[PDB]
Structures are given as structure tokens and as C-alpha cells.
Ligand binder design. Structure first.
Ligand code: FAD
Ligand code: FAD
Ligand code: TZD
Ligand code: TZD
Ligand code: J3L
Ligand code: MG
Ligand code: MG
Lengths: 576, 590
């Protein structure tokens, strides 16, 4: 069957109509020459709100935070050439962290491609390696199909960024024509179904054998329909302790007695202890990246010994086949959506009580007593604010509304401190750049997050160097009155790299953040005395509209515990 | 050979910088590049500039390379460090700026595993570099640094990217490291043929671009040719400064926002001598209607298009050259001039009388000027006036948009490399970072960033870099509260439907105050001259905000679909009824 409703509409007008059909309600973008047919067509549209950032890197990272906070794909519209290349970093960022994004960019007319035309770049060639799929739309008649293909690809499997190049003749032009089982299919499907059920049955047998089980949950659980609920059901039924990755934070309730909190190079000592001695590791929507495993050959020794002896090992619930057996050899690989497959797993996992796991949870509670996160060096009343305490007091101050609190971060020491010291209870509350780790992410991601969740508290916990990268987007929050709260940790150092240069081998001076925030039209306060911190934070989270709070912290504060390079996950250095 | 044994890849890098004459490095640390960073940071052999954003690092390296003819050197970490340099890289590829981007990478054993901060950077940056390579072993490090500097500076210069895996730069080095030129006969034959074309030309025009400024001895030779044969000279945007715009033969800039008289001359010339330029679509208008008089001449055998070009892929890409002269334009101009016959201005009275008549008919000074709000063209005219005694030590970097065309049109360019601007990619945000790198390259010169507000908003965080390092650039921010160039396009083509082309703007006085940078704001026509006098006479970084008139069109304009001679010109009556129809639609808002 064929669609006639586009006949006589420009490509720009068709685009505006496809945003309607795709449920898009917010677009982030910046105009220019090649994309003008599309901007003219979304001119004053009542069908979605349009955020104009300062820089189209702002637009991309806002689209990521929007996606992180809502589960919907962030949509970006930029011009050809430098408008497209300015989104390359957010694209690689989204690909690394599985964030769904559709990036639409102008392109010179199809006839001009290859001529080195004004504002021409081989954007499909540049962006291939940093998108999950991309395409140049070559005729207004294929435009609605390509837009669909793009939205579906971004949002399925492991989500990811997709780039659609829109030549100016495609969007300024006028469409003039209408546009659009098996026996072997049933046998292929049953062959896949048998393979999946057998995998889940063996996964359950392994879990049922295990005397020291652990769930290693990641972002995939949060990105799965019903994932957190199913995870809770599984952890409760079999009384299994649960650790998350940085991106899995909030997938499990960190006030539950079974919570091990975050594992990894900067994770809880007890989470790492648990993973190093578990005999069954159940990896749910996580990818064994190197910040988590440490030296891979030393990762999970007891799980490997168990697999070796037929009495356990490593179970891996993964939707993307390329990520199965990439880094760690799974004893049992359960392919596909972790929500759907946990639904089939749980009724075959036998129930176990806490009392059944007394020895395991006694070891875990021992490690928690010995290595509590809350033990670090606190400020003397005449010193500067400790950064860990900033995170603790933000968590205390939001404890009664964690279901509507979104934390976005920069990259560095502060990103690890909030992971460690804020208590995570809400899925999608952690909005942070993990795989690529892009300083500058925090403020624009927080802005997009607040756009997606206008009724939530959204805080950008941002180190000063990171915040210096994209601080121009404060104008975006001010122009549009997007009520993000910004906490700038001013220590005048690139804390994470000076931590590395102090362990393995040295520091910039900041603008005046009160004057700057004044220049940008943002409510602002400064705070350096420990006794004043809590009240400063109460002011920030109760302001109306966008606000910023500078927290003068001291320098050379360690991130502990840390698993240094060359060490195993159990070879962490904690505070003494 | 054998001299580098025992040293780490970082130390080896450190020395290849010495052997390449690198005195200035722009960069930003990370884990994967720390071996290189430990090496060269703290060294007394280099000035290391640490910006806020690696994009700043790249544009800085571009402006440094524009003002100095030396390659800009960038050192960043893997992943987000390298991807943040992709726009500077594309921008440099499009404008032929020599640049060597060194970026950290994960250890070679970790590549392809989605390791921490890993990207396929050679894959991402292949399409936007001249060439790129991943260094696979300490031993190939010297050879690859050499090749990279060689490619970035040869032919048409451009950016190269070198991927440095962390184990290559931490590892220790333990090893050691017939023809017949009938081509000369043919080059010489075609230089002679080109001279015969110039000598027979009755209406010659030199169309000069950036390749002249990029060729050693290029401007000197361009002036000798133009003087000897009395040939009028027009330049592209990047060519501004290759020829003295105060010379009576100067036609100024051609193209979509070129002088009407330069465009006229190109369309009526019978011999177009194209020196180190590439027939950009911002230059030619509709190509089929470009250079009718020279195509007509070429057919009849009495003229045509001479193209002096170093990159073969760029000859005959857009326009058929009647006579192509491949190679360096300066070296080839040394061989051309002795074969060209001297002619005085008077020998060419008829041609220069046509040009003079075009100049009276369409002077660049005829724009709406009574003294309520400041007009952006006057700002550019006064900068030209106030630096007239020092144009040879004056460097202008710009953003992208109306202000960039206005300074192209209304500043009188006289110094090679004085025009520092993004023309090929056209990257808003280029100005301030490029001005910072230029002033690093020319510490004793006066360096000005003529920036529109939207452009400036893109990268204004680099004001901290000028403050921290005390890099004395002078910033002129034209405050019109709009994406001026795009509102023109929407006014022209879209019935004043101003779709998302207006932005708030921070308080620039407070912003400059916040960054520790001396600052003034001017809004009155009477005070403009004193404002700019204060700015150019400060010490260290400074910023001036000029509040200007809104909705000011850039004229003349050759709009889309027009031949180079079919331009629009300023009409006082159309302008006051353009503002009036704009007010009914926008319902009193504009
Ligand atoms: C300075 C710094 C320090 C860091 N330190 C740590 C640290 O100590 N600990 C830590 O954990 N991280 C740390 N990180 C973050 C780290 O680099 C990774 O980004 C993070 O570990 C990835 O977590 P993840 O595997 O849950 O998420 P992702 O990287 O998004 O992987 C999720 C996996 O789930 C799969 N998936 C998605 N949807 C589904 C579905 N429906 N069903 C099944 N599978 C699905 C995906 O395909 C993928 O394989 C740090 C980052 C930085 C910048
Ligand atoms: C908003 C906007 C408006 C613009 N409007 C105009 C306009 O009106 N007019 C205009 O002219 N431009 C304009 N531009 C700039 C334009 O798009 C191009 O960037 C510019 O015209 C290119 O100038 P060029 O050919 O001199 O330099 P390049 O693009 O750098 O080309 C130089 C050429 O010289 C060759 N070359 C290099 N070195 C040598 C050598 N040693 N010997 C021989 N050949 C050599 C190169 O290979 C290349 O072919 C505009 C840009 C923007 C953003
Ligand atoms: C865009 C970019 N460039 C460089 C890096 C390398 N890098 C750098 C320079 C870090 C220091 C972050 O400093 P900060 O002020 O933002 O936060 P802390 O002081 O709390 O560490 S952390 C890190 O991974 C990066 N992650 N991202
Ligand atoms: C990075 C980027 N984004 C978008 C564009 C598209 N674009 C835009 C948005 C222009 C308006 C520039 O406004 P300005 O304030 O910087 O200067 P004017 O008001 O004088 O035009 S000009 C132009 O080419 C671009 N060139 N570069
Ligand atoms: C390539 C980047 C540089 C861009 C410069 C700006 C160009 C333009 O702005 C116009 C424009 O945008 C109209 C389109 C159209 O919609 C119109 O109504 O006028 C029409 C085809 C229906 N064209 C064809 C242009 O070149
Ligand atoms: Mg810091
Ligand atoms: Mg402007």
C-alpha cells in the first residue's frame, strides 16, 4: 500500500510531519544554510519544543541527557559541515554508552557532493565509526522511510546514535509521487527458541548450585522493560547480593540489605571482595569493561575455579551478540533482552532465604564493617569543604524524593565520589558519561534531563575543569528557563589526572563563577566553610529556575577505595 | 639511527619536536597521552598552551599556523580528547592549514575491545585529514612523526593525525633506525604558453587566493607581475592581504559578497590568471554563467583561464583551465614574469576606465549610515583607519557570518597572513581561539578577534586561556542579538520567518569581568572611535562590546541562482520598506 499524504510537501515539511508520527516532543538543534528548508518547516511548530543551545555539542549532550532521563531517543537538528562535525563527540559518547539518538544534519545538494562545496564535509564517512548506523537521504521520496529506519535502529537492540544526512535539494524539494511467515522461518524460530530455553535452563541450574552468588547488574537492566522489578524479584527470591556498574546505579535499591553498591576500580571494597569470591556471577546488562574487571586474567578467580570444577561460573544476559565473549568467557550466555529472559529464568531459580546464605552474607557484612564507604577524612572546621561530604549531603537532602531526583556529572574525581557517596535508588537517576568519559557532558546533559523531566529535581555535579568545557550552555538554561541546579566543585585542579600523576608519575585557574553566573543570568551562591555547606545546598535545591552553587573544596583529595592499574579487583587501597 | 636507544616513546616524541622546529604546542592531558605529556610539559624547549576545550586547542593551532606559516601542533588524549578535535581538523582540511594532531590511544592490546576512553579515531578522522596513521611500535615513532610533518606541510598543506597508543609512548626503544625530467620541458612549455595568453590579453584579471600567501615569495611575485603588466588584482576571502588593497589596481574581494567591481571585472575579463585559488562556489556564482568573456575568448583562441595550482586534483575540478601550470605558484611565477611584457596603466586606459566606472557606480562605502545605533560596517572601517599606520603588524581573526563579510569588505587588507578566518568549513567559534594562537605566534603584533555574538558564544570559555596565559588578543564582539547571516537568508528566501535565529546573550561586561579581562561597552556612534582606540591601546587581553543595529543586510550580494554579475546592491528606499514589511509579519517584534 502507498501513502499519498506527502504529495506536494517539501522534504522539510515531510520531516516536520515525521517528527509528529514518531512522537517527538523535543528537538535540540542549531540552524544554518544547508538545513534551512527544515528550520523553515518547523518554524513555530506547536507540536514540539525546540531548544537552541550555544554550540551544537551542547545540542548533542542535551539529547543524551534527555534520552538518559526518559528512555526516548534524543533528537538533534544541525546544519552541514561544522554543525555536523560539532556533534561527533556526543555521537561517540552515545555509541559508547548505548544512548539512543537521531542526529539530523544538513548537507550540500546531492549534485554538489564531492566538489568541496561550501560547508561540505564527508559526514557519512566521518560519522560511520562513531554511530551504530548512518545514511544520506538521496531523494525526497525515500525520506519518510529513512527517518523510520533511523528511529528504529537507534532504539532497538542496544540503543545508540544514528546520523541522517539531509541534502538541501532533498529537503527543499517537493515530493510528487506516492510512497510505501514461511516454513523455514518457523523452523529457524523454533531452533532459536530451543537454543534460548536450554541456555536459561542451564543458567538456572548453575544459579541453583551456587553457594556464593552475586548479581552484577548494569545499564541493560535499566534499559529493559520491567528490568529493575525483575532484578528485585530475582535477588529477593534467591537472596542474592547485587552490585551495579556506574551506569547500573539506581537499578537496584541501595538501601536494601543485599546491595553491594558499585563495583570496579573505584567501587566499594566489599562489592569487589564479593565478585572475587563468588562462585556464580550473574551478569545482567553489563559488559565487563576494564574499569570493572581490573586485570582480566585476575578477574573473578572463584567463579573461574567453579566453572573449572563444574559447580558454577559466569552467566551473561546480553542483547548484543558482539558483546558476548568479548572480554570474559561466559559459562552460559543467555542472548537477548534481559527483562524478557529474566521472566523465563526466575520461575526455575529455587528460592533461598537469607538464613540459607548466612555464611555468604556474614562475609559480606564483615567486609562492609571493615570498608564502609562513609569512612573518609572529614574537614576540620577551618578547612575547605570535603567533596565526599558534598555528595553525602546531597543524598541526605534528597532522600525523601529520590524517585524524582536526577544526578548528571562531569568526568573525574567528583564523578566517582558521587557514585560512591550518593545512595542510588531510582532507575535512570544516574546520568553520566562512562565509556567515552566526556568532560563537558554534565551541564548540557542535565539541561536535556530537566527538559525530559520538568517536574523533577535535576542536579549537575560538575568538576571545575569539566564545567569549564561547556559552561557557555548556562545561557541555554537561562534563555529557556530550564531549572537545572549546578554544583561546581572548585578545587583548581584536574583531580583525576593529578591522582594518576601522583600514583604513576603534575592544574588550571578558573574564572570567577559568581561573576560568570551573574553574567549568564543564573541565581548563584558560593560556599567554602564546612558549617555552611548544608544550608548552601538547601538554597540550591529550593530555588525556582536555574541556579548554580560553587563549592570551594580542597585539592589532592584521594578517590578511595581505588584498584590501581596492574592490580586485581581485590587489591584495592582504602582509606587508613 | 641508534641515537634514540634507551629512551621512552615520550622522550623520543620530545626530540622529534626539536628536530621539527616546534616551539609551540597546544593540548590537554589525559590518561592515554600522559607518557607524551610528562615528556614535553615542563620542558623549556616548548611553549605549552593548555586551553579549556580541545576544540580550542585545535583552532588555536590553526590560527598559530595561519599567522606563522609553521604547522600547528596539537596533543590530546584518546577518545573524547581526539573527537573534540574533529571540527578543527575538518576546518583545517577545508582551508589547507598545516596541523599535526597527536592523540593518545589505549594500549595496542586493548584496541578493538571498547576499552576505557577508546574510539576508532583513525577511522573517524580518515575523511577529515590529509592522512593519518596509528603508531604500532616505538621503533616506527620517528619515521611516522617525520612523515606526518612532511604531509601536513607539502602540496596543499592540511591536517594529519597520529594515533599514539599508551604502550608505544611508555615503551623503551631497543633497536636502531634512472629518470628523465621531460616534465621540466612540459612545465616550461606551458609557462611559455601562459605568458603568450597574458601578453595577448586585452582585459586581464589576476584572481589570487590563499596559495599565494602560502607560497614562499608569493606576494612579492604577485606584486611584481601585477606592476610590470598593469593587471588588476582581485583576491578571495583567504587571499585578503596577498595584494595591497590600497594599490590602484586592487579590485578587492570577489564572489558572493565581493565588491561589485571585482565581480564585473571577472565576468568581462578575457584572461583570468588564477593564482593559488580553487574556484569555490562562494566565488563563482552559477558556474555555467561564470567568466563568459574568458570562455568566449578561450573558444576563439585569444585568451582563457590560466590556473597556477599545486594540487592536481584541484585543476579542472570546477572550471576548465585553458592553460594549467602545476606546482608551486611562487616558483612558477619566477619563471612567468620575465616572459610577460611590461605595460603601463595608460596602455590599459580603456580597461581601467571600465573598472573606475564600476567603482564609482558601486562603492563599498554606500551603505545606510542618523547617529542613533551603531552600524557594523563603520566598525570595520574604523578598525582599518585606526590601524592604518600598522597594517603590517596587524592580524584580524573572525567568527563566521555577517561580521566576517563586513570586515572582508570594509577593512583595507595589506599584509600577507593578516586575514585569519574560517572560509571552507565556516566554523563559528573559530575567532577567539584562532586569535589566541595567532597572538601566540606573533606576540609583538596587534591581534584582533572580530567576532559576532553567536560565533563568540560558541567558544567564549577560551577567554580564560587568554587571561591565564596573558595572551594579549583584543576582542570586538558585535552585539546584534541574532544569527545575522541566517536572518538575512530567512529574510531573503523565507518571508521573514525567523526560525530559531535569535539568542539571549550573556552580559559581556560581567563575562569579561568574570574572566579577569579588561573590558568596555560602546553603543553610541559618537563614542565608537574612542572605544576602539582604547581597545587597541590596552596591554594584555581586552574585550570591547559594540552594540549594533539589527537586521542589517550584507551587500553587495550574489544570491543563489545568480550569475556573478547579477548582484544586489544597497538601495535606501528598498531598505526602509524592507524593515517595514518585516515589522508587519513579525508583528512589531522585528
Ligand atoms: C573516570 C571513570 C571511572 C570509572 N570507574 C568505574 C568503576 O569503578 N566502576 C564501573 O562500573 N564503571 C566505571 N566507569 C564507567 C565505565 O567506563 C563504563 O562506562 C561502565 O562500567 C559501563 O557499565 P555497563 O556495562 O552497565 O553499561 P554499558 O557500557 O551501557 O553496557 C551495557 C551492556 O548491556 C547491554 N544491554 C543493553 N540493553 C540490554 C537489554 N535490554 N538486555 C540485555 N543486555 C542489554 C549492552 O549491549 C551492553 O553490553 C568509569 C568511568 C570513568 C570516566
Ligand atoms: C559566510 C561565508 C561567506 C564567504 N564568502 C566568500 C566570498 O564572497 N568570496 C570568497 O572569495 N570567499 C568567500 N568565502 C570563503 C570561501 O568559501 C572559500 O573558503 C575561499 O573562497 C577559498 O579561497 P582560496 O581558494 O583562496 O583558498 P583555499 O580554499 O585554501 O584554496 C587555495 C588553493 O591554492 C592551492 N595552493 C596552495 N598552496 C599553493 C601553492 N604553493 N602553489 C599553488 N597553489 C597552491 C590549493 O591547493 C588550493 O587549490 C566565504 C566563506 C564563508 C563562511
Ligand atoms: C574532553 C576530555 N578531555 C580530556 C579528558 C581526560 N581527563 C581529565 C583532563 C580529567 C580531570 C577532570 O577534572 P575535573 O575538574 O572536571 O574533575 P575532578 O577535579 O573532580 O577530577 S579526568 C579525565 O578523564 C577527558 N576525560 N575528557
Ligand atoms: C558551528 C556552526 N554552526 C552553524 C553554522 C551556520 N551558520 C550560523 C548560525 C550563522 C550566524 C552567525 O551569527 P553571528 O552572531 O556569529 O554573526 P552575524 O550576526 O554577523 O551573522 S552563519 C553560518 O554559516 C556555522 N557556520 N557554524
Ligand atoms: C549550502 C550551505 C550554504 C547555504 C547558503 C544558503 C542558501 C539558501 O538559503 C537558499 C535556500 O535555502 C533555497 C531553498 C528554497 O527553499 C527557497 O525557498 O529558496 C527553495 C529551493 C524551495 N536555496 C536553493 C538556497 O540556496
Ligand atoms: Mg577539578
Ligand atoms: Mg550576531
Amino acid at each position: 500500500d502507498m501513502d499519498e499524504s506527502f504529495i506536494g510537501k517539501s522534504g522539510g515539511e515531510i520531516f516536520h510531519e515525521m517528527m509528529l508520527r514518531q512522537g517527538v516532543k523535543h528537538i535540540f538543534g542549531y540552524p544554518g544554510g544547508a538545513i534551512l528548508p527544515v528550520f523553515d518547516a518547523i518554524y513555530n511548530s506547536k507540536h514540539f519544543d525546540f531548544i537552541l543551545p550555544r554550540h551544537e555539542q551542547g545540542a548533542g549532550h542535551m539529547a543524551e541527557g534527555y534520552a538518559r532521563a526518559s528512555g526516548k531517543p534524543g533528537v538533534v537538528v544541525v546544519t552541514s559541515g561544522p554543525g555536523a562535525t560539532n556533534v561527533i563527540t556526543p555521537m561517540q559518547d552515545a555509541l559508547s554508552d548505548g544512548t539512543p539518538m537521531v542526529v539530523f544534519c544538513g548537507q550540500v545538494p546531492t549534485a554538489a557532493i564531492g566538489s568541496d562545496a561550501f560547508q561540505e564535509a564527508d559526514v557519512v564517512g566521518i560519522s560511520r565509526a562513531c554511530t551504530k548506523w548512518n545514511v544520506m537521504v538521496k531523494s525526497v521520496a525515500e525520506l519518510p522511510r529513512r527517518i523510520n529506519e533511523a528511529f528504529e535502529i537507534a532504539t532497538s537492540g542496544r540503543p545508540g546514535p544514528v546520523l541522517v544526512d539531509l541534502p538541501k535539494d532533498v529537503t527543499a524539494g517537493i515530493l510528487r509521487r506516492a510512497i510505501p511467515p514461511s516454513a523455514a522461518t518457523r523452523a529457524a524460530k523454533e531452533l532459536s527458541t530451543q537454543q534460548l530455553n536450554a541456555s536459561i535452563k542451564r543458567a538456572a541450574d548453575l544459579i541453583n548450585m551456587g553457594k556464593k552468588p552475586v548479581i552484577y547488574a548494569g545499564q541493560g537492566v535499566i534499559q529493559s522493560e520491567g528490568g529493575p522489578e525483575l532484578l528485585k524479584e530475582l535477588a529477593d527470591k534467591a537472596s542474592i547480593p547485587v552490585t551495579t556498574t556506574l551506569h547500573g546505579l539506581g537499578a537496584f535499591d541501595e538501601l536494601d540489605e543485599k546491595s553491594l553498591h558499585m563495583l570496579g576500580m573505584h567501587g566499594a571494597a566489599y562489592a569487589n571482595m564479593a565478585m572475587q569470591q563468588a562462585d556464580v556471577i550473574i551478569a545482567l546488562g553489563s559488559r565487563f569493561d576494564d574499569r570493572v574487571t581490573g586485570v582480566v586474567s585476575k578477574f573473578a578467580p572463584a567463579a573461574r575455579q567453579a566453572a573449572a570444577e563444574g559447580r558454577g561460573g559466569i552467566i551473561h544476559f546480553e542483547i548484543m551478540p558482539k558483546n558476548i565473549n568479548k572480554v570474559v568467557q561466559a559459562t552460559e550466555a543467555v542472548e537477548g533482552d534481559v527483562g524478557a529472559n529474566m521472566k523465563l529464568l526466575i520461575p526455575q531459580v529455587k528460592a533461598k532465604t537469607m538464613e540459607d546464605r548466612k555464611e555468604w552474607f556474614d562475609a559480606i557484612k564483615g567486609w562492609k564493617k571493615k570498608y564502609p564507604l562513609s569512612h573518609y577524612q572529614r574537614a576540620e572546621r577551618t578547612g575547605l569543604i570535603k567533596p565526599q561530604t558534598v555528595m553525602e549531603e546531597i543524598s541526605n537532602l534528597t532522600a525523601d524524593r529520590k524517585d524524582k531526583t536526577y544526578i548528571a556529572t562531569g568526568v573525574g574525581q567528583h564523578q566517582m565520589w558521587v557514585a560512591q557517596h550518593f545512595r542510588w535508588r531510582h532507575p535512570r537517576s544516574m546520568i553520566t558519561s562512562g565509556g567515552l568519559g566526556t568532560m563537558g557532558y554534565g551541564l548540557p546533559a542535565a539541561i536535556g534531563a530537566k527538559v525530559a523531566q520538568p517536574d523533577a529535581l535535576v542536579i549537575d555535579v560538575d568538576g571545575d575543569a569539566s564545567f569549564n568545557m561547556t559552561l557557555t550552555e548556562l545561557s541555554t538554561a537561562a534563555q529557556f528557563n530550564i531549572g537545572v541546579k549546578v554544583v561546581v566543585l572548585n578545587n583548581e585542579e584536574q583531580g583525576m589526572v593529578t591522582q594518576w600523576q601522583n600514583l604513576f608519575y603534575y592544574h588550571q585557574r578558573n574564572p570567577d563563577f559568581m561573576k560568570l553566573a551573574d553574567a549568564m543570568g543564573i541565581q548563584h551562591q558560593r560556599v567554602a566553610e564546612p558549617d555552611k555547606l548544608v544550608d548552601a545546598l538547601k538554597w540550591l535545591i529550593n530555588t525556582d529556575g536555574p541556579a548554580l552553587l560553587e563549592v570551594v573544596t580542597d585539592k589532592k583529595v584521594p578517590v578511595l577505595p581505588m584498584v590501581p592499574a596492574g592490580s586485581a579487583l581485590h587489591e584495592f587501597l582504602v582509606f587508613d
